[PDB]
Amino acid sequence: PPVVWRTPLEELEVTIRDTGDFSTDAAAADDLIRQYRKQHGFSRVVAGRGLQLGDTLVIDLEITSKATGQALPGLTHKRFSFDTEADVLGITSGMLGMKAGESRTFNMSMPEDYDVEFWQSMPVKVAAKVHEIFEWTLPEFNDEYVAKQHEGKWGSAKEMREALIASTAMQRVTELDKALEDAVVKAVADALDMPEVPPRMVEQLGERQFQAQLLQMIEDRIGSREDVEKLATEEMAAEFIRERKKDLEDQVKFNLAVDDIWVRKGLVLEDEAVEAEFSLRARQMEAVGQPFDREDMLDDVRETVKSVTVIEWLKDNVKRHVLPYTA
């Protein structure tokens, strides 16, 4: 129960990289402008050539777990429309050169930033059949295009570019705030003498995270409730916990460390904050029609609210070093 601070909490520092600069935002705005224009683009069936970056297409898609052969819900479709240049999946690289009629099975890691948290970095097999391929010429980007096609939003080509640059730069700011939370959490985890993290505590947290992400899937309607509950297998749950063992141990060290700091810095739980987090958790559990132990939820709601309060504290009294972006 007593925590051993190898490196003191007073001499504790995080370091994070800025994740872009002006020329990165401008590039990204230019790519958003291209996607707006492609909604007003001219299309033609491609012939005597295979799929290239820039094309759009219609495909049969089937994406399955490598470990379990389970189909990822949301990602089986007979006539999926798809732009190579707005590719949330990363399936483009593995499809270049395909032609109408051709099929392909190929291995891939799901993206690390995928919206559906369950599937981040998961090794996956993609089966794809291409029904048809389309290429595009875009209208020129000038004030006339802006006035004809996005009127009332922007009064100029310049206005639109500036708007989209600001929005991309505002997104780096909130991504960076998140990397700070993660760095501050990895800081405390790393600044502890604990050669072995209590191992039921890693499994228990693995299991809670597993459930929280299955629930996020049902409430965000990213696949049928019956399909999502078909991935709630022991095999899937094993695979999830193992492929995050390091992340889960760091997270337990932090939770134990959070229990130390709470006494040391004399922090006080506000009952209104615990009841706000509990009711939020209880709504979720109702909408998905599932029972829970009130007391066990309460230990978990209390763990989460403390964690939120110690992260806020660390954020405003830990030594920040922000490194800058480089090519």
Numbering used by the authors: 140 to 466
Text of the article:
Prokaryotic cells and the chloroplasts of plant cells possess the ribosome-associated chaperone trigger factor, which binds nascent polypeptides at their exit stage from the ribosomal tunnel. The structure of bacterial trigger factor has been well characterized and it has a dragon-shaped conformation, with flexible domains responsible for ribosome binding, peptidyl-prolyl cis–trans isomerization (PPIase) activity and substrate protein binding. In eukaryotic cells, trigger factors are only found in the chloroplasts of plants. Chloroplast trigger factors (hereafter referred to as TIG1s) display a remarkable sequence variance compared with prokaryotic TFs, while the typical organization of the three domains remains conserved.
Here, the crystal structure of the plastidic trigger factor from the green alga Chlamydomonas reinhardtii is presented at 2.6 Å resolution. Due to the high intramolecular flexibility of the protein, diffraction to this resolution was only achieved using a protein that lacked the N-terminal ribosome-binding domain. The resulting atomic structure of CrTIG1 lacks the first 137 amino acids of the mature protein (without the chloroplast signal peptide) and will be referred to here as CrTIG1ΔRBD. Visible electron density starts with amino acid Val138 at the beginning of the linker region between the N-terminal RBD and the middle PPIase domain, with β5 being the first secondary-structure element. The protein resembles the dragon-like structure described for bacterial trigger factors, but without the tail (the RBD). The PPIase domain, which forms the head of the dragon-like structure, is prominently tilted downwards in CrTIG1ΔRBD towards the arms. The C-terminal domain of CrTIG1 stands out by its unique features and differently arranged arms, which are not found in bacterial trigger factors. The arms are oriented towards each other and do not show the prominent ‘open arms’ conformation of the bacterial trigger factors, which build a cavity for substrate protein binding. Comparison of both chains in the asymmetric unit of the crystal structure shows differences in the position of arm 1 but smaller differences in arm 2. Indeed, we measured a PPIase activity of CrTIG1 of 0.0057 µM −1 s−1, which is 100-fold lower than that of EcTF with the substrate, but still measurable and within the range of other plant FKBP proteins.
